[PDB]
Amino acid sequence: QMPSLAPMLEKVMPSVVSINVEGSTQKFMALGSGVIIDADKGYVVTNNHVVDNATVIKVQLSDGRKFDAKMVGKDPRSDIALIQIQNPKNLTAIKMADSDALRVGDYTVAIGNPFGLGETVTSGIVSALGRSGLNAENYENFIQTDAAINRGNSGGALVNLNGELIGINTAILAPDGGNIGIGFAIPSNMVKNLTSQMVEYGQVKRGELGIMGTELNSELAKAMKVDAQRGAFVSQVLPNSSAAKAGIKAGDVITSLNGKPISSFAALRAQVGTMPVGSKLTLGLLRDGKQVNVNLELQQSSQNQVDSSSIFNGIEGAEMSNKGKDQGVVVNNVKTGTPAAQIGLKKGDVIIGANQQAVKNIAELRKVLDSKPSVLALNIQRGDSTIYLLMQ
Amino acid sequence: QMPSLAPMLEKVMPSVVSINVEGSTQKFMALGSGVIIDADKGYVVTNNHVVDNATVIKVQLSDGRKFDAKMVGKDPRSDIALIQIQNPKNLTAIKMADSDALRVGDYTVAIGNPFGLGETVTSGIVSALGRSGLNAENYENFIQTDAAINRGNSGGALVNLNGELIGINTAILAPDGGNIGIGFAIPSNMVKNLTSQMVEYGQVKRGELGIMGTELNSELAKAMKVDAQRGAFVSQVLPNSSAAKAGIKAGDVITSLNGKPISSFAALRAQVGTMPVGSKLTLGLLRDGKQVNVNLELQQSSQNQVDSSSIFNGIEGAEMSNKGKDQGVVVNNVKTGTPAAQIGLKKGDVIIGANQQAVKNIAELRKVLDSKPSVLALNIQRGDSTIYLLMQ
Amino acid sequence: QMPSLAPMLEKVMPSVVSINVEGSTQKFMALGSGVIIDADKGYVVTNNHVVDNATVIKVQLSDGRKFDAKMVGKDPRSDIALIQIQNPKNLTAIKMADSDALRVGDYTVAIGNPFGLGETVTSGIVSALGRSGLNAENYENFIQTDAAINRGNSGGALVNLNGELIGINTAILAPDGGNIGIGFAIPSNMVKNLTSQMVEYGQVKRGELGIMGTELNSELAKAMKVDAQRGAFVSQVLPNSSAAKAGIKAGDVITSLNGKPISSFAALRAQVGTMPVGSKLTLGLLRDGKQVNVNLELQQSSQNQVDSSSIFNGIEGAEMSNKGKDQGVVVNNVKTGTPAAQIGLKKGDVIIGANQQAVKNIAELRKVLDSKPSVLALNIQRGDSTIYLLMQ
Ligand SMILES: *P(=O)(OC(C)C)OC(C)C
Ligand SMILES: *P(=O)(OC(C)C)OC(C)C
Ligand SMILES: *P(=O)(OC(C)C)OC(C)C
């Protein structure tokens, strides 16, 4: 006879964890919150900013259990980070919902380990959608809530009444770190993408259309004589880019994506930066007051990720990423006074093996690194040659 | 199958705006929130304190549109301020509800542009009613809510579930400007009055009964042997005042107004200061343990408003207000080292015309001021004479 | 047609008060909130920390009435404090609910006089249960809510929708004293006990089992090869203690109390420290992976309470408590440079009478103290003798 959530919580809370962290760059200790995604695999998620540069990470459950977890992919652009659990047993995944069919007035609840306070749930509603702009350079399309959030809730969950996930508590706004009743979370849908990506590549393959633009406000719609106070304005398409080929002109405006009306440029950015190269999609334009529908596909780009620190833990130096197919790891760029290179390391090299163990990708690598060889045998190859590098 | 507000929001949010301000007294920029009242006229409202001394004010909509607005009446006593929109097209007014039939336990939602965050809605309930006292001298009878409010929400809305208005987010309590979960808003009813007033006069015509008093607490009820721990105590009626004539004695207590029980004096004040001269009303007393019912009518007073700055924008000097019927604007009081007077201005004068354009009231005036004559031709009249004053 | 709480509030709010305080240790003034427990007796409650060292305490009602109240028992260990009202007339008690059958997801509302703001109600849900640890030494098993709470709400109420009590707003977490959306309250059940105790003894009779232990986390369950990530670990039973007799071994873990599963040690502590000596109860163990059920009974201990200040108001010196049956008050321990002793006071003494008025317990005492004799006639007895001490 008393409306409550506890009923559903019983069912959902389990699918959430309190994350405890140790790392270095000086030694540090932190904490956040994570969410089970695949019950069997033990796939938890979290704000990258909670796990960034993490040496040891342990996960604690709703029911007291402590597990050890490992990095599986970071994307500090949108601040997500998939991690996995060592020996996942008897877990509880979570159902996801469609962040897209959200409405402003719906209610939401957020759980997390704020201030190391164990499973802490709070309540609120959708304050507003598609908010962005804190760190303009990041892919942000936050949902905004009045639910109560703080240090700890980071990577925590935020669900509809049905105990279905819709976004992740990322950051809040607050002078003097304290909840004013304004929290932000990353829409489920976005996360799903960034997720299933790393799930299969240990990293993010960023698709771009190859365009420039800026927020269409009212003044602009005036100057450029169109009907639309919100939207994405096409500054200047790129040549030989998806956009180019697609047939889009500088001075056009986009009103929708895959049927989904577009609040503003910021979102559009985050929306697609989210998606994986080759991802097909359909757009609604409006050049010269005339509506347009066009199809497209994300192409390559020229991005940056995974460093010689995010895998070596200490061995600064060149950036590193996969190569061709499962053809090993390529050293992007060795610095100057960097220890990696002070091991014989030089850009362009192409690690193919180690400790009599073939390497096809960062996975097989950090995997050998896990065995923690006291002595480290690199089987790389400069130019047409074959050599080895060493370590301790 | 999921209870939500979004349904109604769809319908209401539109009737709300984000207010952006530029003024001077040194140049400044601010922001607040406003609410459409008359869909056709383009009548928005806001805390006076958000628009006070405003040079240029633009209004942005729920749907991206930007409009220009103009002052139409300020009442910094209760801090409301009606403004209108230049070229109102396709607008959305809002339905008002009866702030009087409110109850403490009802739910409420507040929207506004806090921190310039675009349409931001938050949720809560009626924390309590008839709260007052922040600035004792103001007419305050706030409703109090735990809904989330901040800089920006000022002039924002606060509605029952039905999307009917009940009060305006004015101020919150907070050390270190931040929402602790205590917000205040001015009851609809109050606002309605202050509103439809300016609607027809560009100003406020304050009625008074002509009495003095103070909060009847428990101790007092003791000393003066009555049964009532809350109420308004009649210190000393005034002679030839409504109260006088009505027949009220010093040492009486008021328990109700127009049937509406009275929490305390503070409210009673705000309640009536709210109302326009001549407004009829009925009261419930209690002199010598004996209940009383009496009728009355607000009379004149001796108040202050609309300055030579609120209309001149820069030209300090005498205060100014209407005169008799549509008989022009009267200079209340020229200071000493004030530029207005350093134009030939002197108290008692009675501007009757300007630029071959008759003037009957502040409206017709600020209206000519809008045409922004480079050179300003005043057709005033000292004593029985007729003269002109000038400007640039 | 609009869901609300006001309906029930109408009925409940009355059962709550705004507490105003004057005391010394330098003169001070404070405020909190209290709750009527017994409508006829006028039994209000509050955080001890709100009333501690109180000289004069007045209570104000939901309906404006002011009453005078008196101390009736303090327990600064769990921070509750029963007080009574002088001449209780036409009061409103409150129904209590079972804090034990609570669930995390249920909604709650909290009322109180925050910042001296008169009856202020706010809303939220059960953020989480059995939280402890702020002041480890206190008996804490708080319920945690996102409802809005602040200075003033202390001793305020916190109820289920039905207007049934479930806990008392004690403290909140907050850097820069301000509600972040994290409040804590003491479960009803706990309070009931501490309550009906003082109701009949003016003090707390602490039962102990006589054991030591510490929080069973995961690591521990490893080391000691058991299945249970939460619980109370039995460090070392005491000899001739309830536990001893009961038959409990060091290295056992408790999983439940009176059927009620046990979150952690902290709770268990608060739970039982709560209860009165001789209180019977049943436990669920788990030594060597094998479940156990045992019965028990709280015994005596060696605690501390009620000082020569909490009753004398100024007369520091020895601690004081009851003795045997209604056999008067015993001086626990006189200090050195303490005024009480500088009246002829010495430990071991046994006040039996005063002003030709027999004394059997602290009650009959503070009762004579209430008559406020200008001159104070003590009828004590050192060893086998009979003497008198004096005062002014
Ligand atoms: P997150 O838990 O939440 C945001 C307000 C940042 O904070 C830490 C753990 C980075
Ligand atoms: P308002 O938006 O809200 C109150 C807390 C003052 O604040 C500014 C714009 C004056
Ligand atoms: P309480 O009203 O609430 C806690 C946050 C302490 O605070 C005072 C009266 C001690």
Name the amino acid, one letter, at B222: K
The answer to whether the beta carbons of residues B34 and B54 sit under 8 Å apart is no
Residues in chain A: 392
Look up the CATH number of the domain holding residue A319. 2.30.42.10
Nearest by Cα to B70 from B242, B202, B261, B223: B202
- Tell me which residue has tokens 């009480």: C340
Q: How far apart are CA B360 and CA B362, in angstroms?
A: 7
Residue A285 is labelled as binding a ligand: no
- Tell me which residue has tokens 């009847």: B216
Q: Which residues contact C89 (CB under 8 A, 6 or more apart)?
A: none
Q: Report CA-CA distances (Å) from B146 to A74, A146, B63, C59.
A: 39, 11, 28, 25
Q: How far apart are CA B217 and CA C66, in angstroms?
A: 9
Q: How far apart are CA B23 and CA C175, in angstroms?
A: 36
Q: How far apart are CA B255 and CA B234, in angstroms?
A: 11
Residues of chain B with Cβ-Cβ distance to C114 below 8 Å are: 182
Q: Which residues contact B229 (CB under 8 A, 6 or more apart)?
A: B216, B217, B218, B221, C61, C63, C64, C65, C66
Domain boundary among B77, B94, B111: B94
Q: What secondary structure, in 3-state letters, does A38-71 show?
A: ECCCCEEECEHHHHCCEEEEEEECCCCCEEEEEE
Residue of C nearest to B178 (CA): C178
Question: What is the layout of strands, in order, in the sheet containing C253-254?
Answer: C211-215, C232-237, C253-254
Domain boundary among C65, C94, C123: C94
| Both tokens assigned to B119 | 């349409």
| Both tokens assigned to A144 | 């905004």
Instruction: Determine, yes or no, domain membership for B370.
Output: yes
Residue A199 shares a structural domain with residue A249 = no
Name the amino acid, one letter, at C69: A
Residue B163 falls in which region: left (phi positive, over 0), alpha (psi -120 to 50) or beta = left
Helix ranges (DSSP H) in chain A: 6-12, 48-51, 188-198, 218-223, 242-246, 265-274, 362-371
The answer to whether the beta carbons of residues B199 and B181 sit under 8 Å apart is no
Q: How far apart are CA C258 and CA C264, in angstroms?
A: 15
Q: How far apart are CA A33 and CA A170, in angstroms?
A: 10
Nearest by Cα to A57 from A313, A362, A374: A313
Give the angle subtended at the CA of A75 by the CAs of A74 and A79, to the nearest 5°: 105
Q: Which residues of C209-241 are buried (b: 16+ CB within 10 A; e: fewer)?
A: bbbebebbbbebbeeeebebbbbbbbeebeeeb
The answer to whether the beta carbons of residues C40 and B141 sit under 8 Å apart is no
User: What spatial distance separates the first Cα and last Cα of chain C, rounded to whole Å?
Assistant: 66
| Both tokens assigned to C162 | 């039905």
Q: Which residues of B142-181 are buried (b: 16+ CB within 10 A; e: fewer)?
A: bbbbbbbbbbbbbbbbbbbeebebbbbbbbbbbeeebbbb
| Both tokens assigned to B267 | 């409210």
Nearest by Cα to B82 from B150, B142, B34, B27: B34
Domain boundary among C261, C285, C300: C300
Pairing, β A142-145 against β A80-85: unpaired
Please indicate whether, in this complex, the C-beta atoms of C2 and B162 are within 8 angstroms of each other. Answer: yes
Residues of chain A with Cβ-Cβ distance to B62 below 8 Å are: none
Residue A192 shares a structural domain with residue A271 = no
Residue A327 shares a structural domain with residue A290 = no
| Both tokens assigned to C143 | 């319920």
Q: What is the DSSP string of B311-364?
A: TTSS--SSBEEEBTTB--EEE----SS-TTGGGT--TT-EE-EETTEE--SHHH
SS3 call for A254: strand
Q: How far apart are CA A270 and CA A207, in angstroms?
A: 11
Instruction: Determine, yes or no, domain membership for B2.
Output: no
Please indicate whether, in this complex, the C-beta atoms of C144 and A120 are within 8 angstroms of each other. Answer: yes
Please indicate whether, in this complex, the C-beta atoms of A125 and B120 are within 8 angstroms of each other. Answer: no
Instruction: Determine, yes or no, domain membership for C5.
Output: no
The answer to whether the beta carbons of residues C241 and C299 sit under 8 Å apart is yes
Nearest CA to ligand 3 atom 7: C151
Q: How far apart are CA C390 and CA C376, in angstroms?
A: 5
SS3 call for B200: coil
Name the amino acid, one letter, at B94: I
Neighbours of C200 (CB within 10 A): 12
Q: What is the DSSP string of B79-97?
A: TEEEEEESS--S-----B-
| Both tokens assigned to C208 | 């102990």
Q: Is C90 exposed, middle or buried (CB count within 10 Å of its CB: 0-12, 13-18, 19+)? A: exposed
Residue C229 shares a structural domain with residue C308 = no
- Distance of alpha carbon A263 from the chain centroid: 21
For this entry, resolution in Å reads: 3.6
Q: How far apart are CA B72 and CA B362, in angstroms?
A: 10
Helices (H) and strands (E) in chain B, counts: 7, 26
Q: How far apart are CA A56 and CA A61, in angstroms?
A: 17
| Both tokens assigned to A200 | 């299969």
- Residue C153 near ligand 3, beta carbon < 6 Å: yes
Q: How far apart are CA B265 and CA B228, in angstroms?
A: 13
Residue B106 shares a structural domain with residue B128 = yes
* Active-site entry in A33, A154, A188, A310: A154
Look up the CATH number of the domain holding residue B200. 2.40.10.10
Neighbours of A56 (CB within 10 A): 11
Q: How far apart are CA A367 and CA A371, in angstroms?
A: 7
Residues of chain C with Cβ-Cβ distance to B131 below 8 Å are: 117-118
Instruction: Determine, yes or no, domain membership for C31.
Output: yes
SS3 call for B45: strand
- Name the phi and psi angles at A90, rounded to 5: 55, 50
Instruction: Determine, yes or no, domain membership for B5.
Output: no
Instruction: Determine, yes or no, domain membership for C2.
Output: no
For testing the chain C interface, which of B104, B141, B159, B255 should be mutated: the one with the most C CBs within 10 Å? B104
Neighbours of C136 (CB within 10 A): 9
Residue A61 belongs to what domain range? 12-94
| Both tokens assigned to B286 | 């209690």
Residue A105 shares a structural domain with residue A202 = yes
How many Å lie between the centroid of ligand 3 and the Cα of residue C169? 8
Residue B240 shares a structural domain with residue B278 = yes
Partners of A114 in the β-ladder: none
Residue A388 shares a structural domain with residue A339 = yes
Is C374 annotated in the active site?
no
Nearest CA to ligand 3 atom 2: C154
Give the angle subtended at the CA of C87 by the CAs of C82 and C92, to the nearest 5°: 65
Q: How far apart are CA A274 and CA A194, in angstroms?
A: 6
The count of structural domains within chain C is 4
Q: Which ligand has the nearest atom to the CA of C177?
A: 3
Residue A65 shares a structural domain with residue A40 = yes
User: What spatial distance separates the first Cα and last Cα of chain B, rounded to whole Å?
Assistant: 66
Q: How far apart are CA B262 and CA B284, in angstroms?
A: 9
The answer to whether the beta carbons of residues C214 and C235 sit under 8 Å apart is yes
Q: Greatest CA span in chain B, whole angstroms?
A: 77
Q: How far apart are CA B202 and CA B311, in angstroms?
A: 12
Q: How far apart are CA B268 and CA B284, in angstroms?
A: 12
Helix ranges (DSSP H) in C156-206: 188-198
The answer to whether the beta carbons of residues B57 and B22 sit under 8 Å apart is yes
Name the amino acid, one letter, at B362: I
Q: Which ligand has the nearest atom to the CA of C149?
A: 3
Instruction: Determine, yes or no, domain membership for B121.
Output: yes
Is A78 annotated in the active site?
no
Question: What is the layout of strands, in order, in the sheet containing C256-257?
Answer: C260-261, C256-257, C280-287, C290-297
Q: Report CA-CA distances (Å) from B123 to A148, B180, C164, C251.
A: 12, 14, 24, 50
Q: Report CA-CA distances (Å) from B43 to A234, B181, B305.
A: 36, 30, 21
Q: Using CA atoms in the order A277, A283, A287, A292, what is the torsion angle rounded to 10 degrees?
A: 130
Nearest CA to ligand 3 atom 6: C171
Q: Which residues of B111-120 are buried (b: 16+ CB within 10 A; e: fewer)?
A: bbbbbebbbb
Helix ranges (DSSP H) in A109-231: 188-198, 218-223
The answer to whether the beta carbons of residues A104 and B9 sit under 8 Å apart is yes
Ligand 2-lining residues (CB < 6 angstroms) = B 32, 49-50, 149-154, 171-172
The answer to whether the beta carbons of residues C199 and C107 sit under 8 Å apart is no
Q: What is the DSSP string of B104-116?
A: TT-EEEEEE-GGG
- The helix (run of H) or strand (run of E) holding residue A129 is strand A120-131
The answer to whether the beta carbons of residues B32 and B154 sit under 8 Å apart is yes
How many Å lie between the centroid of ligand 3 and the Cα of residue C128? 20
Is C99 annotated in the active site?
no
- Distance of alpha carbon A120 from the chain centroid: 24
Residue A357 shares a structural domain with residue A295 = no
Residue A19 is labelled as binding a ligand: no
Rg of chain C taking only CA atoms, in angstroms: 23
- Name the phi and psi angles at C265, rounded to 5: -60, -50
Helix ranges (DSSP H) in A106-212: 188-198
Residue B344 shares a structural domain with residue B276 = no
Q: Report CA-CA distances (Å) from A152 to A32, A93, A216, B316.
A: 4, 20, 36, 54
Q: How far apart are CA A383 and CA C310, in angstroms?
A: 87
Q: Which residues contact A245 (CB under 8 A, 6 or more apart)?
A: none
Instruction: Determine, yes or no, domain membership for C222.
Output: yes
Q: Which residues contact C74 (CB under 8 A, 6 or more apart)?
A: C48, C51, C52, C81, C305, C306, C310
Chain C: which residues have CB within 8 Å of chain A? 103-107, 124-128, 131, 144, 146, 160-162, 173-176, 178, 180-182, 217-219, 228-230
Choosing from B169, B176, B184 the residue with most ligand 2 atoms within 8 A of its CB, the one to mutate for a pocket test is: B169
Q: Which residues contact B138 (CB under 8 A, 6 or more apart)?
A: B77, B78, B79, B270
Q: Greatest CA span in chain C, whole angstroms?
A: 77
Residue A251 is labelled as binding a ligand: no
Residue A289 shares a structural domain with residue A215 = yes
Quote the minimal CA–CA distance from A328 to chain B in Å.
Answer: 47
Residue A168 is labelled as binding a ligand: no
